Amino acid sequence: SMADRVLRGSRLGAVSYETDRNHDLAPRQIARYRTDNGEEFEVPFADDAEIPGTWLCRNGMEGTLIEGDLPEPKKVKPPR
16 A cells, blocks of 8 residues: 555654763754655754755655754754
8 A cells, every 4th residue: 555645753752773871962953855655854064064955864765855843933043
């Protein structure tokens, strides 16, 4: 079976690969991207990088950049 659009996850988790807290944390940008089935995923970018208009999602489809929050809260661009 298949569907044209689908929404699935993530109340029961979960993250991919052998990730652990021993990796530590560093200055980053968490973006979101939406696939062609409407499936939305999150992509962490490092301070050495920026967010391109689109990026490949873990579903195996090219996702397009969307915001995970509202148009006009208290939000600004600087510093990163």
